[PDB]
Ligand binder design. Structure first.
Ligand SMILES: CC(C)C[C@H](N)C(=O)NS(=O)(=O)OC[C@H]1O[C@@H](n2cnc3cc(CO)cc(N)c32)[C@H](O)[C@@H]1O
Ligand SMILES: [Mg+2]
Ligand SMILES: [Zn+2]
Length: 843
């Protein structure tokens, strides 16, 4: 055994040993209990990020722990390959998105393999291969026939200088990001998933997920946004009916979740697209400009509450059906056309947004709720203003004294006898738009024929193959410019027809890949029936918090879609969910002659302050933040592997912080990981250099010295701690410190005797197995030096309960070192000032 720890000498061999034994290439063996542990698969962006290593190390710890516990573990990996980065790279470097993708995949695959993750590479998938995406085209055609996929016109942002569509996140002050040109709103036909049909299913089934962070569950409940409210109709005043037609001349209909405050409405608000706004703006140019500015906006709902709320009065009035009050109609920028009736009522006293709106415009506020004897102040908001639980109505005529629900029912009854309203359930959730005006994505399997209409491609003809021999130019997506692709024959009548040129939202690939891993070479369906029945659902899912809403909701949606098609049998794809934090690093800069800052990478800086590694000209040390190209602070994990080995990388990510926490890049941290691995190596080496391996101590520990009993107590205590940390708590830094404490106590125990060496063998054989999930290369190597059996078949260390039993310490008795003085005095009496450990005072 070499004296010094050298990871490049040991990590290739251990990997070859694991590969040769095929421990991670798993089948559907019904003679072993399955465990499906899955990490969110990456975009083939080019190379691994430190965030990738953190995520996949965590997955590997959990996977190796379950394997060591005798599970049939599947840990699959693959490539979320479609999307914009390949297209941007194609436009910048004059290469095909497919070519750039496959090169990144094969490079990143080598990096993953070098880190020694226990991965079933036989189950690899790449979503940009037709053998993969044909199956989402297939599901598409079936849902299209059932109407779950449908086609309606939608509005998009059109950049006329870049000649493509832009999401709202790419519009700043009404202009495109990479162009600066004013975008135009356009209505184009697009395809949608009728996800709103599954809204109550997707909401209620969240309650089943006892092993998900309640933060994630709560963010999904808020996103679906179900409310039980009330449709209320306010009749248009006779002096306000000019220019209106139909039901819009008779009443303004709104939806509200607080009908118990209808008596407190002091104005109503309407969206810019509403016929009342249209009729009021007919001869008022200030309203026209407000309506245009509202339509010009492109505000994503991640920022539509940050938006300053503005409004304009219309001079039109409506009548409150419960008190007959006349209420002015306002056009407001926060009322969105397409949500409910595109019109709301406002109760400034009991809705904080209404309060602030009424405060800006000096609109009236009428208190109709009271909570205890709390004081109501019309000029400062208070949290209790909005309480529904502990409140009673006031200033509400015959409704006074009622609580929330009884008032709700009383208002529904009053409105329904009058025909002025009725209860209604609403959801914030919108249908899922999937059309993308991009090339590098899965083709939509629809053909347009002027005789037959929008026709799905027959299953016999799937896939619609995306041509890989394309280089995006930047003057529109290429598929619309490629008659060789879109000119085709109608599969229904045989005549001239054109393929859909839009591609699918790339979230679609990642909404079902976890099922595809179960049978990735299955040619007859999305997933084999045999394999879906065996593997069931994912037991453990691990990925970043940035996917808590969209991806997980889509994933749960597709699972219920696939279940309803008869392809799978589970209601929910993900049993346990672990969300990993960010990775941050310090940033560096030198100032600009043009009054700015230029951001230097950490690898090109050396800290004494700090100065460059090139010019030696000092750089300024700045703030710590998420590793990214913005402030050029990403640390390449490849150079960390090059400089220290994979086990160091893995250990450092697991020790620095718990998974949910942000992991700070730390050079002193990495050096500490390496040194502990060096200490682990030397400990085993020094142990063998004195006597060589012996049979590990087992059995009755009577006759062992107090010192060696104490070490066995620490050992099996550490084993139980680590197991509870891997299985339950999923905090891996605490497990590492526990093993470090075990080694500390070993270091201070004389283990030189014969029973001493037997206990030392027991200690070391357990520690290497307890650390194998975090650092399997060095543990595999040291284990072979200690014991000739196969580590993965020796299995997870067992706790020895006997080793936790502590000893036996006008009349004396005997009591355990775990008893207490309540029975120490009950055993002595067979005021008693008990002497814990020497006597007892019978007064
Ligand atoms: C299932 C689908 C939707 C996954 C998708 N292909 C994806 O996000 N693909 S991805 O390639 O972007 O990331 C794959 C996984 O690794 C994590 N990750 C990667 N780079 C990271 C950098 C930092 C910086 O602090 C932090 C984290 N957490 C990072 C990321 O959260 C995700 O769980
Ligand atoms: Mg359950
Ligand atoms: Zn036809």
């Amino acid at each position: 055994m070499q004296e010094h720890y050298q990871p490049a000498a040991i990590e290739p061999a251990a990997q070859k040993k694991w590969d040769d034994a095929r421990i991670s290439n798993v089948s559907e063996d019904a003679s072993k209990p399955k465990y499906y542990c899955l990490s969110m698969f990456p975009y083939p962006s080019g190379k691994l990020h430190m965030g990738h290593v953190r995520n996949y190390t965590i997955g590997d710890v959990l996977s190796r722990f379950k394997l060591l516990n005798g599970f049939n573990v599947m840990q699959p990996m693959g490539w979320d390959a479609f999307g914009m980065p390949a297209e941007n790279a194609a436009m910048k470097n004059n290469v095909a998105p497919a070519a750039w993708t496959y090169d990144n995949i094969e490079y990143m695959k080598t990096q993953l393999k070098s880190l020694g993750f226990a991965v079933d590479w036989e189950r690899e998938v790449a979503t940009c291969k037709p053998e993969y995406y044909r199956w989402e085209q297939w599901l598409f055609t079936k849902l299209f026939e059932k109407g779950i996929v449908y086609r309606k016109n939608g509005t998009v942002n059109w950049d006329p200088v870049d000649q493509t569509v832009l999401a709202n996140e790419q519009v700043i002050d009404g202009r495109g990001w990479r162009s600066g040109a004013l975008i135009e709103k356009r209505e184009i036909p697009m395809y949608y998933f009728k996800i709103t049909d599954y809204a109550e299913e997707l909401l209620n089934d969240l309650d089943k997920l006892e092993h998900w962070p309640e933060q994630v569950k709560t963010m999904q409940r808020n996103w679906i946004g179900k409310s039980r409210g009330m449709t209320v109709r306010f009749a248009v005043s006779d002096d306000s009916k000019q220019g209106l037609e139909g039901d819009y001349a008779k009443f303004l209909q709104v939806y509200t979740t607080r009908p118990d405050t209808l008596m407190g409405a002091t104005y109503v608000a309407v969206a810019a697209e509403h016929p009342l706004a249209t009729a009021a703006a007919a001869d008022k140019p200030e309203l026209q400009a407000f309506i245009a500015e509202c339509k010009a906006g492109s505000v994503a709902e991640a920022d539509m509450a940050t938006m300053e709320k503005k409004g304009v009065p219309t001079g039109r009035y409506v009548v409150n059906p419960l008190n007959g009050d006349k209420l002015e109609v306002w056009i407001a920028n926060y009322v969105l056309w397409g949500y409910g009736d595109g019109a709301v009522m406002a109760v400034p006293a009991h809705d904080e947004r209404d309060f602030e709106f009424a405060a800006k415009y000096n609109l009236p506020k009428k208190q109709v709720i009271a909570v205890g004897d709390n004081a109501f102040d019309a000029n400062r908001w208070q949290e209790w203003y909005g309480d529904k639980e502990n409140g009673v109505l006031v200033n509400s005529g015959d409704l006074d004294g009622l609580d929330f629900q009884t008032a709700f029912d009383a208002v529904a009854a009053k409105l329904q006898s009058q025909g002025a309203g009725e209860p209604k359930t609403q959801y914030r959730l919108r249908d899922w738009g999937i059309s993308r005006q991009r090339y590098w994505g899965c083709p939509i399997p629809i053909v347009h024929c002027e005789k037959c209409g929008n026709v799905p491609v027959p299953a016999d003809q799937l896939p619609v193959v995306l041509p890989e021999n394309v280089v995006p130019d930047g003057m529109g997506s290429p598929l619309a410019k490629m008659p060789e692709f879109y000119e085709t024959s109608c599969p229904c009548c045989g005549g001239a027809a054109k393929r859909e040129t839009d591609t699918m939202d790339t979230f679609i690939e990642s909404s079902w890949y976890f099922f595809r891993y179960m049978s990735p070479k299955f040619s007859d369906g999305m997933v084999s029936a045999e394999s879906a029945k065996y593997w069931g659902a994912v037991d453990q899912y691990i990925g970043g918090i940035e996917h808590a809403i969209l991806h997980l909701l889509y994933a749960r949606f597709f699972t219920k879609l696939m279940r309803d098609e008869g392809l799978v049998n589970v209601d929910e794809p993900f049993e346990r969910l672990l969300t990993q934090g960010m990775v941050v690093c310090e940033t560096y800069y030198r100032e600009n002659d043009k009054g700015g800052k230029d951001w230097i990478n950490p690898a090109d800086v050396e800290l004494t302050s700090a100065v460059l590694k090139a010019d030696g000209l000092p750089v300024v040390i700045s703030g710590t933040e998420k590793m990214s190209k913005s402030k050029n602070n990403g640390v390449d994990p490849q150079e960390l592997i090059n400089a220290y080995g994979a086990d160091t990388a893995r250990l450092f990510m697991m020790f620095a912080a718990p998974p949910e926490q942000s992991l700070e890049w730390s050079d002193s941290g990495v050096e500490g990981a390496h040194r502990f691995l060096r200490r682990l190596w030397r400990t085993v080496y020094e142990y063998l250099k004195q006597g060589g391996a012996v049979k590990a101590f087992a059995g009755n520990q009577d006759g062992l010295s107090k010192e060696l009993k104490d070490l066995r107590h620490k050992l099996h205590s550490t084993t139980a701690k680590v197991s509870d940390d891997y299985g339950r708590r999923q905090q891996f830094n605490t497990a590492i410190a526990a093993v470090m404490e075990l080694l500390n106590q070993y270091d201070k125990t004389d283990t030189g005797s014969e029973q001493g060496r037997a206990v030392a063998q027991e200690v070391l054989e357990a520690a290497v197995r307890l650390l194998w999930p975090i650092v399997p290369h060095i543990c595999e190597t040291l284990w072979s030096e200690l014991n000739g059996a196969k580590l993965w078949e020796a299995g997870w260390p067992t706790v020895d309960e006997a080793a936790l039993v502590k000893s036996e310490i006008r009349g004396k008795i005997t009591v355990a070192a775990d008893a207490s003085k309540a029975d120490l005095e009950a055993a002595a009496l067979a005021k008693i000032i008990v002497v814990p450990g020497r006597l007892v005072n019978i007064v």
